[model samples]
Target: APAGRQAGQQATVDRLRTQVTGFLSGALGKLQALSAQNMDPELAQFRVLDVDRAIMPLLIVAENARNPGLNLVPLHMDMAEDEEVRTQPPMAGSRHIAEFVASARPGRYRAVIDDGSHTRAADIRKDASGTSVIVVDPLRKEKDESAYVDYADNVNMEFGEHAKCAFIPVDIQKSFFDARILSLSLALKMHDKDDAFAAFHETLRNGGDPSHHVSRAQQTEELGATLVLDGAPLVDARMMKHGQAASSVSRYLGNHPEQSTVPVNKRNETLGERTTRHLVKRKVRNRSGETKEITFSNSVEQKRIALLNRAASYVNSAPPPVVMRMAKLLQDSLLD
Candidate 1:
């Protein structure tokens, strides 16, 4: 039964992967067109390679929005050289950026560090470490590596470039309920918590006596289940974009000595407009490991699904101001 249940879940995962891949590929096409236009010199520099590698994790994070714990973790194969640093648990908020930097293969990674009051963007070298860190300020007048040789400074030590990228806020609308409802169901179904919430929702819908039939001994369980089913915003934007939007390319854009460290919203979607709702039937497991076929009204509006549309729209448009900077980073990295 467990095997059957997992197989059912795997199908949903596969469908999502295929649909998402198609949508992102379309976005990449738009970016390539922009590169050909050479309208923006920076855009001309962007290769399809950068956009694909960078956005791959963004798509994954967006798809796994329901599973808040599942986050973007970039791999630093080079970091593996330093056994001491590799053995220790990767620092909090720093892991994702580190991983992205490794995967993106950016020659020089620039990260934005904000301490609520002020923001600073620093170009990070590959060999940087915790106790001994290297952060070359982009704004330094000398414009040479030797001029701004700062090591283990309090600011660099405290906020660390890798950790800085983790907090750059991104705007996400809070109003989509249809997606939230469906997302919640999928999450619950994944963890075997859906049966509990479904029973509660079903009972209420059927006018079951709430006072007696809905009684759970633990007030925590009762209250928790209620909120969980209602689809409370369990994950915040910062947590959601911790990895997805933390790309050095994104943070370094208009954020260095430039000073404006605004919370950027990830772009919005189309290609999938035809299907509004998808009915998914899955074998779900009970406490006793018995499996039951459950029907899910997987709607397009859910964050996981809706993000595909939003990302495509964002990419196809290829807004110069934002996309240009991203291209510049990728181009510069390649040049390095």
Candidate 2:
């Protein structure tokens, strides 16, 4: 802390310190403190590289959205920690930004996250065909995103200048049953209270024991299931960009700040007509190690499967198959 710094500057530093405190907190009462020793800028960049794994239209890096750049022509981030300050242009888009950051300095960059101690350093690497990927084994030190929110919050608030991408919030309409029913499932899934119960809760927000409430549950589950079995599987915009509103780009567009403007390529498919759904079987295991197989229906069977028996639902009946093939692989190992 400097004694001669002006009030406003002091305030900004204070705010940043508090924000950093939150970002660097760890599991089990541990804290990641900044020291006066110079550290690698690559490390800092890697620390925040999570931007790539997050959903679509990752935060925008508005080149013109800052209060002071001295009208600076270069688009760079003033990434400062306890020791030194590093400034460099953060790339555009999640992919470009991460790789750009990772490539800072001169070493072969591998992304690593801090897990308590004694943990094997995690590495981000490319696959056989060259796709950058990260693997998190739950048995290791601090796996999962209990640490992600901290980093995300800090980078967004403290270094708002890095992106101008806005995450606009949209409201979803849910029947009472849909809201309560599905919600409890997630809450139950995450929170450790530990008793499981799936049931019908609304005939309508329609008042008591609306025994008919059970049907509402069935309809929603069916609609969702069919949306999969049929066409249009639920676009769990929760993970990645559900219905891709983005096309791939070949090269960098925002490196030379003075000669460039913010890259402007983005989209919103939900606002469009329709989205196609593809069905594939997936096998998954639960926390308790129970495994399950899941699959869906095709286009011809979409309506037939989706509309089991309702006025609001299914079936022109020239129906299709459920991809049932190949029990014919000869008993030993050779193809028949």
Candidate 3:
């Protein structure tokens, strides 16, 4: 009976793979017909590939065998399904196309903003006059030029004095709180703390699926435009099929920082220090049934924040060519 079950599982997975392959081919055909330049003008400069092999001459960059821009357009695919599309370009002075595909039965769907840059002070510090100031920047990349708010005003931009220009950052604290409770339980179990473990078990046995105050960050044009300037477009495209919904548009803007103004370890570390003396490793399995370990550490976190901020600064900082270029492109693409 166990052997039959294993065979059944394999058969079902094989069938699913076939379905995904067909769907991918259909999608690729539609994409190719549109032409590369029509999708994005810079796509012409990219090395276009079909399946695993390059259709155009590959121009390697920095002797790293990694191309700055890539365009993968599959011709007649004989390669494995897993090798359909894969490329990586660092966050600095390069751009690449990121794609996502999924099969789903959908309904009335809208772009749900989970977390990113919204309005609110990323950091609060005292000025020379001893008055408290709130520095408002989504990623807090520019220390000198960030918008500063007085402490007398509300922290929530939606209700505060900057209601006209500021946006509300998503309230991720609610989800974080729920997660905290669960982590506390595990921590208690691992540490062999008695009373707390009993309390946790009793609470779990009686706990209800309480609807915590989930963070739903408000959106505004200023925030949207800011994100666009930071190499992410707020525009979304969807396919509605017979009262069902398909996937929406997306982007990869590199890693993001913790939702807090100061990371938990800021006091332990320093502004100029990149010290990482403590870390935690978590073992997890992927959808493909492969196991891997992920580390929670200050070094990784700082690097991620730095890379993201650097990319944002490089793209959105100067006026020699301003965000007006991006604004016009957005208007041109959206208006007509």
Best by lDDT: 1
What tens-digit string does per-residue lDDT give for candidate 3 at 135-205? 12222232432232221122222112221222222111111111111211112121222232223223222
Q: List candidate 3 segments past 4 Å from native.
A: 1-162, 166-275, 284-287, 298-336
lDDT of 2 at 292: 46
lDDT-wise, the better of 1 and 2 is: 1
- Model 2 alpha-carbon drift over 4 Å, by segment: 1-152, 157-276, 295-336
Q: What value does the lDDT take at residue 72 in candidate 1? A: 26
Query: Which 10 residues in a row give candidate 3 its minimum summed lDDT?
Result: 235-244
Per-candidate TM equals 0.24, 0.18, 0.17
Worst 10 residues of 2 by lDDT: 322-331
> How many clashes in each candidate?
7, 10, 1
- lDDT to native, each model: 0.30, 0.20, 0.22
lDDT of 3: 0.22
Instruction: Arrange candidates by lDDT, descending.
Output: 1, 3, 2
How much does each candidate deviate from the true structure in C-alpha RMSD? Answer: 24.0, 28.0, 23.7
Relative to the true structure, candidate 3 reaches a TM of: 0.17
How well does candidate 1 score on lDDT at residue 330? 30
